Design a protein around this ligand. Sequence first.
Ligand code: FAD
Ligand code: 0T4
Length: 418
Amino acid sequence: TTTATRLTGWGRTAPSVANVLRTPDAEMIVKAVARVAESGGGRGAIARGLGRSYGDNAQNGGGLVIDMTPLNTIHSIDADTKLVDIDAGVNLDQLMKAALPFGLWVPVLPGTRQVTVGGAIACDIHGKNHHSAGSFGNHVRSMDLLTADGEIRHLTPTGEDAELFWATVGGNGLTGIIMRATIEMTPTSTAYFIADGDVTASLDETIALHSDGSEARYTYSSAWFDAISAPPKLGRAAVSRGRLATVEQLPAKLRSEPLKFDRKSGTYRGKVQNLTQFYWNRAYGPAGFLQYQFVIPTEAVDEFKKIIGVIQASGHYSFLNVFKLFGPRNQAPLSFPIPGWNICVDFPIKDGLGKFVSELDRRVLEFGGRLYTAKDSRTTAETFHAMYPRVDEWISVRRKVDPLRVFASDMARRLELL
Ligand SMILES: Cc1cc2nc3c(=O)[nH]c(=O)nc-3n(C[C@H](O)[C@H](O)[C@H](O)COP(=O)(O)OP(=O)(O)OC[C@H]3O[C@@H](n4cnc5c(N)ncnc54)[C@H](O)[C@@H]3O)c2cc1C
Ligand SMILES: *N(O)c1cc(C(=O)N[C@H](C)c2ccccc2)cc(C(F)(F)F)c1
């Protein structure tokens, strides 16, 4: 029934071997969880989606991994309630294509659509529109969770099961297997964006642009960010901001099918873009690259500037940098986003990199920030627990729901969440 398999995250690092169950039969999945539970836990089980997480959260060395990608049925779409009811293995590209004709838009879109609904929930993913829409968790109306007791719990965000529900959002699969979920989509009349572009010349100017009050005028906003230039050109950014377009905003040619599927000069106004236009590690790493993401609380703006400073001075040079100001956070104890300054950098693997990122960890930690489980397989339990003050609250919920540790992963063991 299972296939022993070498697994890594997307950046192809920290491999381990697991027995992979890959079946479209939900009953086989229930059986397998039950079997692990009846062996008393053993080395446990974790779910896997499309493997786009860079870390070790979707692998389980010496244990069971359940590939959820064959559970990919879209059960219902409702344009009045805006609700879609889909299997957890459904991916966002497939969902985008299916929902567009109903005038529905996937409410949170990350940098790639090759992620499953299960993975979107388990990592509580965020997008270019976080400051207006929150993260993926905010839009989950209900979900079916297969728990350690072999039963499938129906969870809602305010029901009796609220606590389990919000430990599951951002829970990295460690409360059980999300089988199915109901997501509230965003209404739209077109599949296009209308975007305003701006360029800055300094880190301070980037920050002022995000603090002047104009962010509140766009539903989506992110920026490419210079991390190699010494000050004051350090932290200059190419900012892409916008909102979904109405039909009467489209070029006349595109009005026939508005819901169709698919420095210096970079200043513009009312440019009309499809998703691809508006929006290396796997190809070259991990002989090549270490991806690194963190968020610093809004009020700690100067501490943020300094970390940026430390990065440019490091001698570790990242071209691919993405910056964004996160909005308010949600109820999930282990959710990554907090309101604040968020950035992803991609470092070439070079001598002294490990020691340098350990120093970064310390700084993000002291300044009240955190790393993202979706981008990590290197940090320590001590660092992670410190970055997530609600971790003991979350661990308690997990103990109530999985007393025998039927659910387990490489990440759970490394970060002592098991
Ligand atoms: C090119 C690229 C761009 C990205 N951009 C963004 C971005 O803009 N914003 C962002 O937040 N993230 C981004 N990510 C990270 C990615 O969106 C998340 O890691 C996401 O969780 C991956 O989904 P997946 O289905 O591939 O999950 P996997 O990587 O397979 O698994 C991730 C976690 O989800 C759990 N999981 C998966 N399915 C289930 C299930 N059915 N039940 C319970 N748990 C489950 C796994 O156990 C694991 O803990 C990006 C990744 C890549 C490679
Ligand atoms: N980080 O603040 C951040 C990263 C992305 C993102 O899509 N990153 C992936 C790995 C990527 C980077 C560069 C080139 C290709 C892919 C997205 C955001 C968001 F805030 F959601 F816009 C933030």
